[PDB]
């Protein structure tokens, strides 16, 4: 019976809520009331990477913390030498509307996708000299929004269609399909252990998945509107999501609640891209009001502003050595920020 | 600056030159976005002028025009319509004979007209299937005033310039269907964008010239607003 099933679902939800409430013995704000706050952090735009013709949608660092790929509505994926602001490749794309890009851990491949329901994989180190498409991944029924390489042969995608996918590049099939969400998946971050990953999907819900088993493990429902970004804390036991309700929250995969809630009442604009520093002490988040802010993770104090972008920041990534932080925005620029001593 | 770094700088400069050529081509192109419904006959106008995005190419008076019909996508648009900021115009094709769906058409149009990222984007209405509308009221079995009560107090506006061979009631209804959209448009916009009504049938072919004229008009108006002669 539909009524009986609904009653059982309500009872299960109430039991889950009670179990979640039980384990909340103490709050992060109470524990951090004694930890020393960090001083005002200032970063001063060491480099500016010009060359895109329109808005920048996504960017990704290489595992060497020196190379850099950027996707724009132009139809380009430029790989930059961040140290010298050079340009090593300029990849002409097939569809002008790309909402994501990624850099393979080995440096051999890059990925890109957008409204065309395809994750295109580009091979960078060819015997013929130029860059070429190695594989187009086909099955989705909605705009691709984030792709992240695991190995040189396995990639994971997230689509507007209520589905994430795990592909096998050499063949071109969906080895496992994730079918738990109701809305549009907007963000996707891979845990450092490379066995689990998370996503927020335009329904105030964040869901951790298992790459091997293929079953949604947890389901966090703390927000009020669409989730726009997600990012694993370096431990692999947390993640942070910024949403259209102008709020960031920290979720822990074990506790199964929200730990903190990053909200300044003066902020009415939403959140678009979230990355972390290396120690996890810094939570950098792009906002629609033309700037990015450097939140404090443990203490939850708005302890930095990155105000140099003339338009809305849309992407934000931090290197693997924690020595550079890069932002791109709808002003067609890509600024590589760093601290000063 | 070692020899290999100098050659790397040389390669970056060549990439920059190619990017400048691409930038010339990019500014020389005006982009559009074809919105509508399943029965709107938007594809019919496409015939005249898992793939998630289609693309139509057409040239009028040696000016580039890209039209991006949205294909295999779901119902919701609250996220991928953000991608069409910085677009010259939006084309909204409306069916004028499905009175029981015109209200849903308006309810989509008002959201499109009030979207935050579409707050500087003009819309070119192509009210389609006017010939199919003709019979609906001519051999009238269905009354518009049922779905729309305010058809009572309304009458034909003076500025109407119908072609010969029209029932005055036909014109009064047709311009009313034209007028609710304009009522929606004039409510908000702060003069930053405007709506351009047109009446289109499947046989009309000047749809490219009309887009040419309205895009030129939109650019003229934004330039005249920043110069403040407007």
């Amino acid at each position, epitope marked *: 019976e539909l009524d009986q099933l609904r009653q059982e679902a309500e009872q299960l939800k109430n039991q889950i809520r009670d179990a979640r409430k039980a384990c909340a013995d103490a709050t992060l704000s109470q524990i951090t009331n004694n930890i020393d706050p960090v001083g005002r952090i200032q970063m001063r735009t060491r480099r500016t990477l010009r060359g895109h013709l329109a808005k920048i949608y996504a960017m990704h660092w290489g595992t060497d913390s020196r190379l850099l790929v950027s996707a724009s509505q132009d139809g380009k994926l430029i790989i930059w*030498d961040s140290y010298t602001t050079n340009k090593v490749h300029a990849i002409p794309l097939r569809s002008s509307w790309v909402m994501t890009c990624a850099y393979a851990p080995s440096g051999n491949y890059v990925a890109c996708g957008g409204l065309d329901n395809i994750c295109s994989i580009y091979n960078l180190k060819t015997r013929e000299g130029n860059v070429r498409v190695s594989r187009e991944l086909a099955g989705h029924t909605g705009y691709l929004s984030c792709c992240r390489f695991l190995d040189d042969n396995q990639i994971v995608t997230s689509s507007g269609d209520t589905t994430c996918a795990l592909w096998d590049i050499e063949t071109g099939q969906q080895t496992t399909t994730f079918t738990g969400h109701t809305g549009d998946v907007m963000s996707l971050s891979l845990a450092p252990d490379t066995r689990l990953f998370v996503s927020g999907a335009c329904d105030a819900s964040a869901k951790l998945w298992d790459v091997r088993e293929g079953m949604c493990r947890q389901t966090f429902t703390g927000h009020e509107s669409d989730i726009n970004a997600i990012c694993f804390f370096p431990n692999g036991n947390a993640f942070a999501t910024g949403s259209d309700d102008a709020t960031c929250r920290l979720f822990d995969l074990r506790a199964d609640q929200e730990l903190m809630t990053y909200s300044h009442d003066n902020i009415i604009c939403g959140i678009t891209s979230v990355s972390f520093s290396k120690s996890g002490r810094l939570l950098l988040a792009g906002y629609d009001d033309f700037n990015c802010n450097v939140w404090d993770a443990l203490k939850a104090d708005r302890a930095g502003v990155l105000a140099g972008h003339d338009n809305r920041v849309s992407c934000l990534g931090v290197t693997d050595d924690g020595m550079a932080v890069a932002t791109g925005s709808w002003d067609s620029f890509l600024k590589i920020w760093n601290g000063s001593s | 600056l*070692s020899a*290999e770094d*100098k*050659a790397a700088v*040389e*390669r970056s400069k*060549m990439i920059e030159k190619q990017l400048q050529k691409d930038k010339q081509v990019y500014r020389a192109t005006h982009r559009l976005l074809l919105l509508g419904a399943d029965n709107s006959g938007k594809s019919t106008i496409v015939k005249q002028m898992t793939s998630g995005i289609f693309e139509t190419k057409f040239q009028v008076d040696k000016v580039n025009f890209h039209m991006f019909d949205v294909g295999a996508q779901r119902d919701e648009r609250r996220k991928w319509i953000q991608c069409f900021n910085d677009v010259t115009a939006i084309i909204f094709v409306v069916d004028s004979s499905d009175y029981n769906r015109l209200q849903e058409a308006l309810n989509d149009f008002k959201s499109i007209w009030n979207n935050r990222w579409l707050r500087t984007i003009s819309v070119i209405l192509f009210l389609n299937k006017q010939d199919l509308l003709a019979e609906k009221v001519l051999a009238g079995k269905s009354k518009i005033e049922d779905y729309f009560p305010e058809f009572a107090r309304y009458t034909t506006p003076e500025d109407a310039t119908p072609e010969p061979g029209e029932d005055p009631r036909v014109t009064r209804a047709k311009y009313f269907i034209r007028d609710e959209f304009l009522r929606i448009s004039t409510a908000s916009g702060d003069g930053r964008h405007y709506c351009y009504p047109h009446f289109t049938c499947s046989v009309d072919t000047e749809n490219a010239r009309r887009i040419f004229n309205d895009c030129r008009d939109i650019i003229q108006r934004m330039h005249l607003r920043q110069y403040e002669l407007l």
Partner: single-chain antibody
Framework: VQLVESGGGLVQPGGSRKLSCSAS????????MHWVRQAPEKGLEWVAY????????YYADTVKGRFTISRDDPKNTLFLQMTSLRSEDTAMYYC??????????????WGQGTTLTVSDIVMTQATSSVPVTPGESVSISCRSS???????????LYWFLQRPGQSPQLLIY???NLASGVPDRFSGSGSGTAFTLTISRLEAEDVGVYYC?????????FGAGTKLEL
């Protein structure tokens, strides 16, 4: 990937000939190109250079004025003019491919060369000949005058192997990084002024002459070679 060169075999003292190098199988327009010659029984000697885009051109001091390098990207052909030939110009001329961006492998492809007959850091490779038996590790040392390290962290040292009758191959570039298809046996390590190449397990296909080359600043110069006689 295939570079083949054409030219002439006999010429009288004084005069001119034109060489060619037709590429087939790679993006020629993005690859800088070099020319390297070799006396009948001596080592290599760099003789020219043209970069991608034909912007930067270098030459050797021995042929600084009477040789001309050219390029034709649409036809995929590389050219070298040799006017007023001399007895020091009897050599086998090689067409060498090279690209420069972050993490490239310059001098990766060497053509099979063409014969020709006519009727500044200094690097030494003492211990020219040394007997070899398979299974034993062999280290080949190369010496340089100036430090080959640069402020950016590179070290600009290249290693080649010229088998008894073949064309040279790229073994290691910048004295530490392996080339594309080279076996993992080969390894290189240096100091800044002194260098060596380590072959862990000598197979029957590792005989020939090993050459060391610098790329820190033009002109580019070679050593005398080291022959590993079976």
């Amino acid at each position: 990937v295939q570079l083949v060169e054409s030219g002439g075999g006999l010429v009288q003292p004084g005069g001119s000939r034109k060489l060619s190098c037709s590429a087939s199988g790679f993006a020629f327009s993005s690859f800088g190109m070099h020319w390297v010659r070799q006396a009948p029984e001596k080592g290599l000697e760099w003789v020219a250079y043209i970069s991608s885009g034909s912007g930067t051109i270098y030459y050797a001091d021995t042929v600084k004025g009477r040789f001309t390098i050219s390029r034709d990207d649409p036809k995929n052909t590389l050219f070298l003019q040799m006017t007023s030939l001399r007895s020091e110009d009897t050599a086998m001329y090689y067409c060498v491919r090279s690209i420069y961006y972050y993490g490239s492998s310059p001098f990766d492809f060497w053509g099979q060369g063409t014969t020709l007959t006519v009727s500044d850091i200094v690097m030494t490779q003492a211990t020219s000949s040394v007997p070899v038996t398979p299974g034993e590790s062999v280290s080949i040392s190369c010496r340089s005058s100036k430090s080959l390290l640069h402020s950016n962290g590179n070290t600009y040292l290249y290693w080649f192997l010229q088998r008894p009758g073949q064309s040279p191959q790229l073994l290691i570039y910048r004295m530490s990084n392996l080339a594309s298809g080279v076996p993992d046996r080969f390894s290189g390590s240096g100091s800044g002024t002194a260098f060596t190449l380590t072959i862990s397990r000598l197979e029957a296909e590792d005989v020939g002459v090993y050459y060391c080359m610098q790329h820190l600043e033009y002109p580019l110069t070679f050593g005398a070679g080291t022959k590993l006689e079976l």
